[PDB]
């Protein structure tokens, strides 16, 4: 592992960040002082959920809660393939992270994000309560249930 960390090959270190992510070694990746890994995540954060989650962990441990709430909220409003329940977790985290002070950011900007995440989380829970009840309902034909699961187990719908 010395030979690994003693390298200056950049495509290599990118390939190793991806490999650590694959194997699940949050142990070793979260323990890198470097910003090089943060910058690498900032480009692909809004591309994949698993990468965004890593980026948000780096922000939170650095008391940058508002920036994580921003990543999580945009991810919940996006058209990436994300389940409704995963979008409930993202909003719930963003709601908490925007409710606490982050230095350098105005109280107004925090509250406006904490409010957008609170409303979207309220709608998401309604949608989750619906989807669950509809799937379990004995009086609903199977043919329709599959159709319900397609349109409700994804991005959050209007009221």
């Amino acid at each position: 592992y010395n030979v690994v960390n003693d390298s200056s090959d950049e495509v290599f270190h990118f390939d190793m960040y991806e490999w650590y992510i694959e194997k699940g070694w949050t142990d070793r990746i979260l323990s890198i002082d470097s910003p090089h890994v943060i910058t690498y995540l900032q480009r692909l954060a809004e591309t994949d959920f698993r990468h965004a989650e890593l980026l948000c962990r780096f922000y939170t441990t650095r008391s940058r809660f508002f920036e994580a709430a921003q990543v999580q909220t945009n991810l919940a409003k996006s058209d990436l393939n994300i389940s409704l329940k995963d979008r409930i977790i993202l909003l719930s985290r963003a709601k908490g992270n925007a409710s606490v002070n982050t230095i350098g950011i105005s109280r107004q900007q925090q509250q406006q994000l904490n409010h957008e995440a609170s409303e979207l989380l309220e709608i998401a829970h309604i949608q989750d309560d619906l989807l669950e009840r509809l799937v379990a309902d004995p009086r609903i034909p199977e043919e329709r249930k599959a159709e319900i699961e397609e349109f409700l187990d994804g991005p959050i719908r209007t009221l």
Partner: peptide, 17 residues
């Protein structure tokens, strides 16, 4: 923003196509 429209929906109790 909510807008009720009972007019044209999709029969929740009938399959598609």
């Amino acid at each position: 923003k909510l807008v009720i429209n009972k007019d044209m929906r999709t029969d929740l109790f009938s399959p598609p196509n």
